[PDB]
Structure formats: C-alpha cells, structure tokens
Curated annotation (Swiss-Prot), chains A, B:
Keyword Oxidoreductase attached: yes
Keywords, sorted A to Z: Oxidoreductase
Homology family: Belongs to the HMD family.
GO MF annotation: an example: oxidoreductase activity
InterPro entries named in the record: 6-PGluconate_DH-like_C_sf, HMD_C, HMD_C_sf, HMD_N, HMDII/III, METHMP_Hmd, NAD(P)-bd_dom_sf
Gene3D superfamilies in UniProt: Hmd, C-terminal helical subdomain, NAD(P)-binding Rossmann-like Domain
Protein name: H(2)-forming methylenetetrahydromethanopterin dehydrogenase-related protein MJ1338
Annotated source species: Methanocaldococcus jannaschii (strain ATCC 43067 / DSM 2661 / JAL-1 / JCM 10045 / NBRC 100440)
Any one Pfam family match given in the protein's UniProt record, by short name: HMD_N
Alphabetized SUPFAM superfamilies for the sequence: 6-phosphogluconate dehydrogenase C-terminal domain-like, NAD(P)-binding Rossmann-fold domains
Length: 369, 369
C-alpha cells in the first residue's frame, strides 16, 4: 500500500478549484450532505496530495475561494498556479474540473500542446469523454498519438462522505479505445491511492452513470428490472417481448424530450392515463418503485395538466436508434455515415451548447471598434 | 345518454374471445384483481352489447372458453361466429383482440376486403397501430381510402375493476392521420357508451402508455419529473441541461437493451455504481422513487452480478435518434430515407417477430410431400 504508492507516486495536475459558493451556499453541502469546504477540484487536489502525489492545481480566478480555504489547499502540499501551461507541463494525469462549455475545450486544447509523453487527460462531470475526444481528435491522431482520454469523474461532490468512488472511462461500447490500458491502470492507481473505489466503465456510458442524470438512470433501471421480473415470473412473456417493450418505452420518452422537452413529453404521455394503465401491472406483493411512481404522478398530476396544455408536441419520428444506425451504415456505409453518427453522438453527449450565444455575438460587435 | 345512444347505436365486431386460461389460471385475475370471467375480447363484446350495440364476436376456436362462459356471452346478446368474413361485413368498428404475430395481420387483411364503407379497424395490446397501418397501407392507399386505423386498447384486462378506460389512437406525433376525426369520434362514442373514459393519444405513443411496458413508462417518468424538480429547484440547472441529461440517460438505456438485452444493459450500467452515484442526488426530503430504486438495485445487486458477468455488451453506437433522423432526411432526403425510417419505426413498435420461426420452416418442409 504505502510501499506500492512510493513506486507509483506520480505528478498530478487538477484544473479548476471548484465553485465554492455553489457547494457551500447554493447547495449548502456541509449541512445537507456533510464534510467541510473546500469541495470539488481543490478537494480532489488535497486528497491526491494527501496520498503523496506531486499535485499542481491550476485556477486563474483567486476569488473563487476564500483565503482560509486556499490555505487548506496550500497546507496539503498542492502547488497552486494561475497558468494552465505551467500545470500542463507538470502532470502525467490531468483532471479537468473545469466549467461547462467552451472553457473545458479551450483548456484541454491548451494543455495537449504541452503535456508530457503518455499523459492522460481526464474529464469530470462538465464534459463527456466522447465529446472531449472528438474536440482533440485531429491532434490526438496526428501530433500526440501517445496522449490518452479517460475520466476521473467523482460521481459525487469531492469532500462529501458520498464521494468514495471514481468513474474511469474505458473502451467504449462501440469497441473504441480512447486510452491505453497502462493509462487507464494509472487512472485506477490514482483513484485507489486516495482510498476511492475505482469503477472502469465504457467511456460513452460514464456520463449516464456518473452525472446528475444518474438519478433518472437509477429510477428507470429499477422500473426495467421490476417489469422484467413481473414479465417473466407472472406474465411469463418471452424475453424478446419484454426487451421490445423496454426499448419502445425508453426510446419514445427520450425522443419526445428531444423534440418537445419534458413538458411536451408529458403532454404526449398522459400521467393520469399512465396511472390507470400501470395499475394493471401491480402483479407482485412488493413493487415499491411502481407505487412510488403512481403517487408521484398522482400528486404532480393536477399541477402538470396546467402547463402541459400550454406545451406543444413538436414533430417526432419515433424509430429504434441502433436499427437506424445499422441502416445508414449499409445505405450510405462509409465516411458520410461516420459524420452523421459522430454528429448525432455529439448531440446526445454534449453537456453545453457549442455555438456562441446571441449576447456573446452582440457583445463582441459592441467591442469590435 | 340513453337517448343519445339510440341515435349513435352502431354495429360492432370484436375479433378474439380472449385466452381465458391465461386470465383465470395463469394470472388468476378473479382473486388477484377482481371481477368474474370471461375477460378480454369476449368481455369487451358483452359490455358493448350491454350498452345496446349489435355486437358480433368472431372466434374460430370454441374450446378457448368453457360452455358456461360462452353462455354469459350469448346471454348478453353477442352473436358469436367462427368466420372472420361474416364479422367483417357487419361492424363499422372492428376491434382486434387477436393473437400476437401473424394472426393479427392475417385477420386484418381478411376483414379490410369485406369491411363496410368508412369502417375503422382498431388494435388492442397485441399490435401497434403504426405497424397495423404499415401492413394494410397498400390497400388503404389504393382500394380502401375510406377505412381508418385507430385503437380500442383497454390498457387493462376487460372484466377487472381496473378496466375503466380505453386508449384510442389519434394523429401521430409525426403529424400523420391514420383515421378521420369522425372515425375517432365514433371510437370515443363506443368507449364512453360502455361507461369507459376515452383517452385519445398519438397513435405511435398509444402502445407506450397502454401496454404492459406502461410499468416502465410510469416509473421512468416519475424519475424524470423527480430529477426535473431537483434540477431546477435545488441545482438550478438550466432546462436545456436537464433535458440533455434526460435524453442522454433514457436513450443510452434503450440502445443498450436494443443491442445487448436487459442483462447486457445492466452489465454496462453498474447497479452498485448507480447506487453510489444516484445517492448524491438525494437533495429533497421526499424522493420516494429514488429511495425505492436504490433499495431495489441494492437487493437485486448480489443476484445481478452473477449473470451480468455472463452477459456481453454487443457493439453499440450511442446517438440521439431524432438528430440522426433529421440528418438522414437531409443527407439522403427522399424515398430512401422514408424506407430506412419506416423500417426503424417498425423495429421499435413491432410486438412479435414478423419472420417465420425455424420450426415453422422445418414443419412446412416435413409436410411438403
Ligand atoms: C449535488 C449534485 N449531485 C451530483 N450527483 C452525481 N451523481 N453526479 C453529479 O455530477 C452531481 N452534481 C452535479 N452538480 C451540479 C451542480 C450545479 C449544476 C448547474 C451549473 O452550475 C449551471 O451552470 C448553473 O447555472 C450542475 C450540476 C452538483 C455539484 C452535484
Ligand atoms: C396483467 C397484464 N397487465 C396489463 N396492463 C396494461 N396496462 N396493459 C396490458 O396490456 C396488460 N396485460 C397484458 N397482458 C399480457 C399477458 C400475457 C402476455 C404473454 C403472451 O401471452 C405470450 O404469448 C406468452 O407466451 C403478454 C401480455 C396481461 C393480460 C395484462
Ligand atoms: Cl520553460
Ligand atoms: Cl353474402
Ligand atoms: Mg422542458
Ligand atoms: Mg435479456
Ligand atoms: Na487556456
Ligand atoms: Na382470416
């Protein structure tokens, strides 16, 4: 353990101290969840320095944290810098605890130019590893073939008792390696050296189980498993029938949200009807997920009916996504198909809109002359 | 009400008496849910005859119900026949309480040839209205432009107290009319005349809220609404961010099931990790859906780990379906795009495999000579 850490002790660079006002004031984590500030990136840095690593924390904004919190960071042995280039030249592992949007991609492009050989660039919850890879792909493929992309996603707020793990993005479900095994193993080593359980998951799936949306994934998964058990044990429906129903429902809901938002999706799937319909699926003594859902739909039903009749169901073409991917790959086949897929994959995983806001364009024009 | 029924009293044809052994013995509905046999199609026929309509029930298999149950049907005033053609020539509304697979499409093709002018053909849970329309489309477009497609989906087992409603398929989310307003209004009239609440929903969505999969839809919907409320009230995340997370999660889960089944999907989305990750989303005093899900995942976790390591994550290309539909419509655009979409829509909604089983081909070859 300690003897092993000495052999594998490495240089680590964390980018982004974490928005402490968000953690302490808006979320009130010390009272709601536990622990003590700082939280986030600066906390990950403290934990890695506490584990014996040479940690550099790159934060350009000194006012994001009070001076007392900064001392906690400095007292841990973390070297704070304001220049990303200084931190890029340092680590062999770079954790992006950076803001949603342009900032994460801008910093990733700045560091890939100065990272040491075989370094790995790790995302957190503000970006998907797939989208991070797509943005650095031209450099990764030609200039830096040695650089790897993975995750060091806390899937929790570092500094809270809930943070006892890390999600590390591995080979994708489409069989694509964004990083070498050695680089992924080094990410696992870093995680475990800070007393955190290391979870290596397909990179494309990491966001789905690590981000705030994991709430929807957990709930929906329990519904799928409840239905799967009822379907096979009580209904004795064939597995392919149960699978067809699961895909049909989950895919319809995603696509309605995609075109018409949550409100429009609720307008298409009537909660009142769903309560009545799903009630004939109460076939077991304990279906706590179904009972909880029906009461939630029932309680929210009166309030929902108001805004949903204001909502609009925008044109939706409900299709089975993988089946449609397979068809374009045979109808079109090649590079044209690759582009249409990469763009649809990016639309699914992009956390922030890549295009500049109307104000940004107007502000730039105001300062033009 | 009664005076109104006399003006709108109409001829009704129900196809399929309902598998009584399933309802009474395998499901034991009299004791588990309530009511008295018969259930299903023959019950829908009784209720429609009880409402004053001239009902014909077409059932080729007399042994599907005991003689006492048949008397209940005959005593209601329902004319039982064994020839579908005799019932097709009768009603102006045809309800398909037929078996999963080939049988439903075969009967629908037999009746469209003899249905009276302006008749409407209604599906139940064994077929999707979209797939039913696709199978009769060449005849509907050329010979019978007057015929309409809709649903008379009980979204419950007729004969149980839970059956107090009907889902009637209306214009699709893609803005397509499978039936005229008058035909849909007649379906609503038939439903309401039997004391049932009429729910008109987009035809493509009807299965998602009416079928056994409504269990998954209800649960997942409560998870989405829980996350939506937490996201906006506690996290104060923008709506587009909440929407992105909802789509990303629901679409990933559907696609994993599509390529790798439930087991493979559970192998990709680690339940143990999800429990830990989703626990940092317990931001409100009451989140009964999340708490129920975490205990279900926790209880099922030990059992799942056994078969999931046996499971395989088959190649999956995660993309946002609607975004990918929009791209093929501009890259390809025309008829080629229509075909690829109609086929992907059919794969999503088809309840049974359209292709003949290996045994069927082998049996046919055995009786060839
Ligand atoms: C309590 C939440 N619980 C989580 N749980 C998991 N498993 N994964 C996450 O990732 C989680 N979080 C993400 N967070 C979060 C906070 C603010 C914005 C909103 C963002 O700040 C926008 O820019 C508001 O404007 C978005 C996400 C919270 C820290 C934190
Ligand atoms: C209790 C179920 N609750 C329902 N609830 C809703 N809201 N909608 C339905 O549609 C429901 N059902 C569909 N059922 C059902 C029964 C057997 C097979 C399996 C089928 O018989 C296969 O062929 C087995 O083999 C498939 C579905 C049950 C009657 C009934
Ligand atoms: Cl230098
Ligand atoms: Cl005749
Ligand atoms: Mg919305
Ligand atoms: Mg399976
Ligand atoms: Na930079
Ligand atoms: Na027939």
């Amino acid at each position: 353990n300690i003897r092993k850490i000495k052999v594998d002790n490495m240089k680590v660079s964390v980018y982004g101290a974490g928005n402490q006002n968000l953690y302490i004031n808006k979320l009130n984590l010390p009272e709601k969840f536990g622990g003590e500030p700082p939280y986030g990136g600066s906390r990950m840095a403290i934990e890695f320095a506490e584990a014996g690593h040479d940690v550099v924390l790159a934060e350009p904004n000194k006012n994001i944290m009070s001076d007392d919190l900064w001392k906690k960071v400095e007292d841990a042995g973390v070297k704070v810098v304001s220049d990303d280039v200084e931190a890029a030249k340092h680590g062999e592992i770079h954790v992006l605890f950076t803001p949603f949007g342009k900032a994460t991609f801008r910093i990733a492009k700045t560091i890939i130019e100065h990272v040491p050989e075989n370094a790995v660039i790790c995302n957190t919850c503000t970006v998907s590893p797939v989208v991070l890879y797509y943005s650095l792909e031209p450099i990764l493929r030609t200039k830096r073939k040695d650089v790897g992309i993975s995750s060091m996603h806390p899937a929790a707020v570092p500094g809270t008792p809930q943070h006892g793990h890390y999600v590390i993005g591995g080979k994708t479900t489409d069989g694509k390696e964004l990083a070498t095994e050695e680089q992924i193993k080094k990410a696992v080593e870093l995680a475990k050296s800070a007393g955190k359980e290391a979870y290596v998951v397909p990179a494309d799936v990491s966001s789905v189980v690590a981000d705030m949306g994991s709430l929807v994934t957990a709930v929906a998964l329990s519904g799928v498993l409840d239905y799967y058990t009822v379907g096979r044990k009580i209904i004795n429906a064939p597995k392919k029938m149960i699978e067809q129903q699961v895909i049909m429902t989950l895919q319809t809901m995603a696509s309605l949200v995609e075109t018409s938002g949550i409100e429009g999706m609720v307008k298409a799937l009537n909660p009142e009807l769903l309560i009545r319909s799903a009630s004939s699926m109460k076939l077991l003594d304990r279906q706590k997920d179904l009972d909880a859902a029906l009461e939630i739909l029932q309680n929210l039903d009166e309030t929902l009916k108001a805004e949903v009749e204001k909502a609009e169901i925008k044109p939706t073409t409900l299709v089975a996504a993988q089946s449609l991917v397979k068809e374009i790959k045979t109808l079109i086949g090649g590079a044209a198909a690759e582009g249409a897929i990469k763009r649809s994959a990016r639309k699914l995983f992009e956390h922030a809109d890549p295009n500049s806001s109307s104000v940004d364009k107007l502000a730039a024009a105001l300062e033009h002359h």
